[PDB]
Structures are given as C-alpha cells and as structure tokens.
Amino acid sequence: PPRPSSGELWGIHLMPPRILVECLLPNGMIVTLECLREATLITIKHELFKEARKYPLHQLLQDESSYIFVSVTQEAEREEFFDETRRLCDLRLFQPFLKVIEPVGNREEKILNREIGFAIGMPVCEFDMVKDPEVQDFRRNILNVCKEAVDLRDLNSPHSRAMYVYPPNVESSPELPKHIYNKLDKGQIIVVIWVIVSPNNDKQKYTLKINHDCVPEQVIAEAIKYILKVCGCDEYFLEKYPLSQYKYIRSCIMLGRMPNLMLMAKESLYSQLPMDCFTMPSYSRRISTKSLWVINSALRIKILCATYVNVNIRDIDKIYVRTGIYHGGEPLCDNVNTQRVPCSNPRWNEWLNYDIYIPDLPRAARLCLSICSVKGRKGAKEEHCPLAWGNINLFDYTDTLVSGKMALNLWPVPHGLEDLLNPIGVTGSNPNKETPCLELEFDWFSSVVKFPDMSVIEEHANWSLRENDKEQLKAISTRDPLSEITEQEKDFLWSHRHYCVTIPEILPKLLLSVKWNSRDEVAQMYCLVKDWPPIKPEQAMELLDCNYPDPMVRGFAVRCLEKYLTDDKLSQYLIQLVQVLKYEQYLDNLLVRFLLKKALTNQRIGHFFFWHLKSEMHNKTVSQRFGLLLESYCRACGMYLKHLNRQVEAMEKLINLTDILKQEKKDETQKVQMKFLVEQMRRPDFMDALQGFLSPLNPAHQLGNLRLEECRIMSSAKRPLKLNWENPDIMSELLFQNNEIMFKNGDDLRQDMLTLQIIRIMENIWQNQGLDLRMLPYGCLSIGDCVGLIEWVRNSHTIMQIQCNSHTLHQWLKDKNKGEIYDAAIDLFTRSCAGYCVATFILGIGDRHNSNIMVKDDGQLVHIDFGHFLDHKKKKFGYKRERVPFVLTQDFLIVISKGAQECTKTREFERFQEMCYKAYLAIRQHANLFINLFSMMLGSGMPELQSFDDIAYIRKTLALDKTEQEALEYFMKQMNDAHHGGWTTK
C-alpha cells in the first residue's frame, strides 16, 4: 500500500547521524553494523563484507560485487536495491535491516517497475495481484495507446521528439483582439534577440521591429537550421505559428514589456533529446449467449444480507436498504426500499421488484443502493440518515448483464451528503474489507445475458416547420445546461428530433427529452448522434458530466474533442477532463484513451496529467483507476519519468520536514525551529534532492540551487514554508533569478486550485473581447492529501501591511511608482479591481478584508486564500441573499480616482464601472461554459460542490433567468446596495 508517513523509518521522521542495521548474510549469519544515515549501499555493502570475515561460514560468501541488498519498505514491499548509489535514509525502509541476495529475474524490467512505482506512490506489483479481469484487460489493452503515441513521437528526427518535450505554448487562434493589436505600431512588434557567442558565451543584443504575423523562421532570417527560445525558462518556438499566437509574445504586447528572445543552433537541443524508448511489460507477454431484448420479464434484485452497521441501539430505531435504478443522475424508476429490520439483524433476502422492463434497460444502467437508518422518534416526521452506500453496473465492461450472487463492500457517506443514495459515486466494491458487506443475488436467465449489438439497435430504430417554432428551438439551445425543462418542451424537442440536426448545439437539451426507460426512443437516438454534426468543444464537455452516462453519447463527445480541442484549451480544461474520468463505468473507455494519447504526445499536458492523477492516489475510490492510468502513462512517457521522480522525492522531503515541525517540534519556539530547519537543509541528502529539478507549478521553470537566506518558516498556524531557488538559465536576468514557492502541508488547496482556474478562464474571455482586466492568476497545485504548492508573487504586501488613514493605500502606490509610471500603476490597480470584483461576486468567494487582499509594487491586485465559494454560507445561516464579497472600500476608491475626493463622481470611476459591466456581461454570455465546468466537478469531493443545487448559486449571480438588460440592472442593484450608493446607469 501507499506509504503511511514520509519518514526515513516507520515511526521515525529522521534517522540519527548513525544507526544500527541488521544485515542478513546469505549464509544465515546476522551481522549488526553501524552506518551513517547518509551512507550509500555500495559503501555499506563493502564494510559489511569486511566485517563478515569475523563471523562463521565466511568461506561460502561470494564476492561482494555478486550481491545486492533487499529489505521491506514502508509500503510493505520487498524491494531489491539495484541502484547501490542510493543513501540509507532515502530507502524508505520499514525497519533498519538489510538482506543480502543474488540478483535474479529481468534486472532491467525490475528497475523500471520500481521507478514507476515511485512516481505512482504504490508498488506496481500490487496491480499484478488484482484478480479482477477488467483490471488486467485494461493493463494489456491500454498499451496500444502507448505504442501509437511513442511511434508518433519519434515518427521524424529529433524535431518530433522535440515537439513532445517542448511543445509550442500558443493560443487557440492567431487573430489578434482589437485592443491587443493597438499596442502594435503599424502591425509591427519590436523584439530583442540575444545570442550566446560561440566563444565565451557573450550576449549579442539585436533589437528589431518585425510584423507579428511573421513566423519564427522569418525573424530568425533577419540576422542583420536554428531555433528560438524565451530567456529565463524552457519554452521554444518550434512551430510555424504567428509570433502573436505564441503566448509569451501576446502577453508582452498587452503588458507593454519588450519580448526578449534567445537564438539557439538547434543542435544542442537535438542532442540533449533522449531516446524515449517504450518496452512492453510482463503482463502483455503472458495472458450460448442471449440478447438482453430477448429476456422477457421485469427487473428484480434479491437483497440477501449485510454484516454490521455502527450505530447505538439507544438512538436509532431501525435500519433498511434503499435501492434504486439510475441512468446517470436520474432514476429509471421509483426507488425500492426493503423492509425495516433492527440494527442488529441485517437480513432481508427480499427480492426487490423494480417497475422497469428488462429489455428497456439502457446501456449505462446502474444500481445505486445504501443502508439507511430510520429514526421516527420526533413526531410524524421520521428522520432518515444514510450509513453506507454502493453502486454497481448492471452491465460489466463486456456488455454482459450481471447474474448470480454477489458480495459488495460499502463506502462511508461523504461529509455533507444528505441524500439517501449517492448515484454520483464511483461504482464497484470498497477495497477496505473491514467495512459492511452486502450480499445480493441477480436472477439468472439460463445463459449469459448480453446487450444487443449496434446492428440490432439500428434495426429497432428504423422500425419506428413554423418560423416561430424554429425560434423556440433556437432559444432552448441557448439556455444554460441547468435551466428548467418542462415536459411540454421535452416532447417538443423529441417530436422535432430530426430537424435539430440543423441546430447541433441543442443536442444536450435533446438528450434530456429521451425516455431512456424506452428501448424504442433509445435506439432512435443512437442513430441521430451517430450522424450528428460535431459541436464545439466547450459544449461537448457537458456530455461528459454525471448527466450523460450513455457510451454512445460520451463517444460522440470524445470525437468532438479529438477533432476540435486544441492543445491549449485541453491544458486549460484539464482539471475537469481528469475529474470526469471518475464518472465512467469502466476503466477502458474512449475518454481515457484520448487523454492518455494526448498526455503521451505533449509533455506540458502529461506533466499536469500526471500530477492531477497523483494528487488523488490517496483517495481509495479512484486510486485503482488512476493507479492503472498512471502505470500506463509512466511506462510510456519516456525519459520524463526520471524528471518526475526527481520532483516526487523533493516533495517527499518537504512533507517530512514540515511533518516534524508540526508534530515533534510543535511546542518549540520559531527561533528553535529555524535552527533545526537550517541544520537539516544543509545535509547532503537534502541538498541533492531539493536542487536541480523542474517546478511542478510549471515544468518550464528550472528550480536550481536553494537560497537558504530567503527560505523561512512562515509565522502562521499551518506552519507553511517559503522557499527560494536560483534560475539556472543563462538568461536568468530577464524573466527572473529567484523562483519562490510556498509549500503548504495541512490545508486542502483543491478549492483554491479550482478558483484560480476559473479566474484564468474568466480573464481569457475578457481579453478575447477587448477587455484587458489584467488579472494575476498565480499558480496553485494540489499534490496530495492537503499538500500543495503556490507561486509566490514577488513584491506584494497585504492591504493591512500597507496600512502599517484612508489615503494610505494611495500614497503607497504614489511611491515605488512615482512619476511618469504613475498612470500605469493606477491603471493596473483599477483593471484588477474590476476583474476581481466581478469574479468574486459571480463565484461567491469567501469575504475579503485587509488580509485576503494584497497589492504589488506594480499596482497589481492579488487576492489570496479564497477558500469557500458558492452557497457555502446558506448551510450555516439560512440567508437567501447573494453576497458581495469584495466591496471596494474608501481606500480602494481613492486609488482608482487618482486621489480625487467625491470618488463616485469621477471619469475614472465611470470607466471602472464600464469594465465591471462589460466583464459581468461577458462572463454571463459564457455561462454555459462555467455551469459545465462545475458540473464536471460534482464527483470531486469538495463539500461546497456536491449537488447541482450547489451550482445554482452562479445561476443567480449571473441572473440567467432574467434578460441581459435585467441582469445588468441586477448587478448594479447588488453592487449599489453593497457599496452604499454610487453605481449609476448611463
């Protein structure tokens, strides 16, 4: 299993400088040896075989070079240490002992599976033990995606392998927004190119003014078989995109900063490219029926018994099993309960009869059941509390309907969940067999009952306009994915399902009108989506949420993404695309294959693909799914696996270091903790691990050597760590020479990670619509259970730090930005207030104050610690009001108006309001995108984002059920009531 802690031994966070180690020689002798914690195995093996001569049977010991060490790791795995250059403290040993053995088996295959197990956080050999056929089938059949990826990766010379390691970070369209094109003069952009001299690596500045349309090769030819690069990081212009389309240049345009680029010979880059060689594993080496429609009968399931439930008899009266047939989130028929049995005797053997025709069960039909406690002590109202839940796929991954008896281990109820069933939950049995077990029995049809083929489907399918009517169809498609859909409108779409092909965007609403309880309508719908014109990616994603489980539906969605999803947007929406993998019924589906294919063909994608999956390997509901996906990715991601392990080992030592500060040394003063921390960070093992590796926040950033002076334990509760590095890039003076990150161990940063993703998406919508609401969405990444990284914005201070008067905030900006640069700082502070003021209101971010808000010398506004969002305060205090979290105070209004009194009556505040109205409407125009993004996060596990009724909060802050004229009047009313007058309409 995964590691309990991150210490060097079980129950110990740090080995002493010297420690005793029991060495089991191959002759049965046991030799106790004292080793330095930082000692390497090749050394220990030497001293051990020097000491062995002092013991009996020393004659039959072979040469020391003929042996290696093995031991039990903290993961209960018996690991062979083929890399004798590793330190004793870096072995993750359970106890301090080493066995001496002669290596056997495929040495190379063992070394890879150990490297893969390290990145996964779990021994790969555990997957070999899985008897579940679907698991092994996934491990073998997924390899074809791997091979096809590694083939395309090396289809050409180094160039192809280069596009994989350093893909072009380009926008999704080269069209330049009108407000971005204005920054260019006569459609030209001045750029400076530096070239390291062949002798002595000197810098050759070569300022030049060139068109933004010109391809990198065109600017290269200027110079008055080569590649360009950004000074400070590792992103390369390896494709013939318009220079404006590349993100670095496009940002520099709006930011007014002059692009600084470095020219390379393209031979030093091609030579560093390794050989991404993929090798087939061991599980790939070694390895009457009746249709469902023929079965004529009703659905029934016998709930046999359960083992136990944890509830005192003195409080709860009775218990029962609540079951229900579900197709996604909606029931295919009324839920069927069993009889109420006492808590101490979980027995029913009651065949539950469901009102559904067996032949009409859709492909994605599932059974959702749970053991509920009934407590009818408080009047006519009897409270029902869920105790444990569990879900099953009526059809396994092989189209085979279930039959016979079955045992199922149930899961605990997720915090905050109040429903009696959890259909959004993952299917399958709980691996923790120390949990309640529910015995079921599906009837058996004297043969393997299977689902009819696509051919039979189309056979049963073929067996079966006013302009104002055309307008009603058009408006239904424009509505958001969460607007009410009356029955009259369901039949309206179903009756015109063939005309809908002209308006492809209506397909989501159309699928909601389908009577999935009817084989007749289902079959016909399969034929419409088969030949349905592809829809836009942002709309296809809606098909992947918990509402659209049918495979054919999801398959169509996948083919839209494969065809029209850019590598930019895929990286933009990767969080949700990873989350939706939990909703899939089976391990092997088209979605997972598409994502894995993209992860193996783009390293900027695979990096975050890896960390998103790794960050939830602690979650036993998806650990097996993500474990098998990670195994397949690492087995084929090539040489980047070496760099990922460098990242994993660095995080493991930061987790261990912070674990000691908040456990063993929690009651010692900060003067003592810093003494301990600096003393530990100076050891060889700690410097070799935390120096020279890629930044998980951005693999383009190289984290070099530590700046221990800038490192410091923050004087806070969670005891976070602020770390500083050196940027090893030769041109480190351009981008940055210090890369600072905050390592947090204790606070769940998932909600904060999602909030920063939506803010980026919001800023993207604004820039495309000529609205430079300059937002600073710094990087945030969750890498484990309440462990994550956050990018440290340099030169920022909290509004409370600035005040240590109403004009205090404005006089501070007058300094550090005095003179001709004054109008720039004000313009940034205002443009950031607009984006933040609109983004916080739309989402419902936790209240802001002088501590959550920060200002940079730049005048840039930086909100921090968002935390809650949506209707999180409605459960605490039953208030049905939409809150204005970020209320511009007098201090903030003085800054926007350049210090003018009567701040509400200034041209600057007029333009400020314009940005808010334009940004609020802009987002309101894209409300379909944001409602789908949250919809794809319902099975994530965030307490403030569980049911579609939690997402309805943003349906109100955007006034979606009102007209665009009424919504802007609602926003004004909300802002005017929270700011105490001032917001006017022009």
Binding site: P1, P2, R3, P4, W10, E22, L24, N27, G28, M29, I30, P56, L57, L60, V72, T73, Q74, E75, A76, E77, R78, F94, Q95, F97, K99, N310, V311, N312, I316, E330, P331, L332, C333, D334, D355, S373, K375, K378, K381, E383, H384, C385, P412, E418, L420, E434, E484, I485, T486, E487, Q488, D491, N517, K875, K876, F877, G878, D949, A952, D961
Partner: protein
C-alpha cells in the same frame, strides 16, 4: 378559491420543490409561480423524477396545451386530481393524488408574536451552531482515526513480510549449519560450534522481538478500530438530529421574514 388552495406555494424555487418532493411517492404534486407575468408551474412526482408541467395563460383561460379549456388553475388541478394525465400526454400516466399542503410550512411555527418567534429562532440558531461545531469536531477525529488505522494496517503488513524474511534467515542458517557443525564435531572445534549457535540465538531473539512489536501494534489496532466504531455511531446519531434542527431553524427564519415587512 384564489391563492388560498394549499398546493399553491407562490414564489418557491425549484430547490424548495425538489426538497418538498424528495423521496416522495408518484402523484405528489404542487404548483408555484413561473421561474421566469403570473405564469405557473405544476410539479409532479413520477418514477422518482420531478416533472415540470407549465400552466399556460391566455385571456382568462388556463391549460397545458394550446386548447386552453379550464378557466382557473384550481379547476385544472381539481380536474386532473380525478383524471389521469395520460389523456393529455400518454407518457405521463398518473394523477394528482398527493397534494403538498402548506400544513408543513405552518407546522413548527408554534408561536404567534414576532418576539416569541425571534426569541425562539435565536434559541434554535444557538443549538444548531453548537451541534455543528460538535459535529465538525467529531468529524475530524473520525477522519484522523480512519487515517491512523490505515497506517497501522499497512505497518502490520510490513511486519509480516519482515518476519517472513527473518524466518527465511533461520531456515537458511539451519541448512548450512549441519554441513559444518558435523564437520566440527569430528574436527574437535567445539568453540566454533558455539559461535554458530550464538548467532542463531541472536537471530531467534530478534524474531521474537519483531513478533512482539507486531503484537503490540495489533493490540493498538484493536483499540483504535473500536474507537472508530464509537465515533461512527456518535456521528450517525448527530447527523439526523442536526438535519431537522437546521430545518427547524430555517422555518422559524422563513416565518420571520414573511410576517415581517417585505419589499
């Protein structure tokens, strides 16, 4: 009558209907205003779903389809309370049989003066926060206990695998030993037989120590396994009480806003 029937709930939201219809038997219905005037929406329970049937309005006549026959919403609800919806649309073969009445809204009111209601609302709001803090506190011990149990279980997995290694060491020593202790028995090397025996005692001792470390960890596991079950019980007891406590608080709050001046 008009706006006096029990099934008319005025300006309730879809969420208020879903909760009022959650786990309700087919036929349970209620009517509310148009979410998007004076348009109306009948909400009906059928097959575990909540179906929305819009009530159209044109020149004093009401109805679901274009031929608006009924002259009042009360006449429409009462008619289909005795006639099946299948006549309108065969897909919906059910009738309005279980009306959700305001009886539940006026339930729990108890007091009639704003101060008494407010004073009582303040009592409930106090008990709720005190049971939320108690619940959230109990939840962390629940999560913490669950994690440390997973750790202890993995550690015991490590103890077993380790003991197997040390036991392999014994049988390994037993195999080589005989071939040499018999050679010393004749070679008169009694002291070398003692050195082999001593190392064996050193190995059997460690095995006996490592087994006891697993025994003490298994004992701690039993203690924590039970403590987890007692926490689970206390949580499955606070959850149902905390729920209705929150609902009672919300109702008193709903009573206070309605009785008070509104915009």
């Amino acid at each position: 009558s008009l706006q006096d029937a029990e099934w008319y709930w005025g300006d309730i939201s879809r969420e208020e209907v879903n909760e009022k219809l959650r786990d309700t038997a087919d036929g349970t219905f209620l009517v509310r205003d148009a979410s998007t005037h004076g348009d109306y929406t009948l909400t009906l329970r059928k097959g575990g779903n909540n179906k929305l049937i819009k009530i159209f309005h044109r020149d004093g006549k009401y109805g679901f389809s274009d031929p608006l026959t009924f002259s009042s919403v009360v006449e429409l609800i009462n008619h289909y309370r005795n006639e099946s919806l299948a006549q309108y649309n065969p897909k919906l073969d059910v009738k309005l049989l279980y009306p959700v009445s305001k009886y539940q809204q006026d339930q729990v009111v108890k007091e009639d003066n704003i101060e008494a209601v407010g004073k009582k609302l303040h009592e409930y709001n106090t008990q709720f926060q005190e049971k939320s803090r108690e619940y959230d506190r109990l939840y962390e011990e629940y999560t913490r206990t669950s994690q440390e149990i997973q750790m202890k279980r993995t550690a015991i997995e490590a103890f077993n695998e380790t003991i197997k290694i040390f036991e392999e060491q014994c049988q390994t020593q037993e195999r080589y030993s005989k071939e040499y202790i018999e050679k010393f028995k004749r070679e008169g090397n009694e002291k070398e037989i003692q050195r082999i025996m001593h190392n064996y005692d050193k190995l059997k001792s460690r095995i006996s120590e490592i087994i006891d470390s697993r025994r003490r960890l298994e004992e701690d596991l039993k203690k924590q396994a039970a403590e987890y079950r007692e926490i689970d019980k206390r949580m499955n007891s606070i959850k149902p009480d905390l729920i209705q406590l929150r609902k009672t608080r919300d109702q008193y709050l709903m009573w206070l806003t309605q009785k008070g001046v509104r915009q």
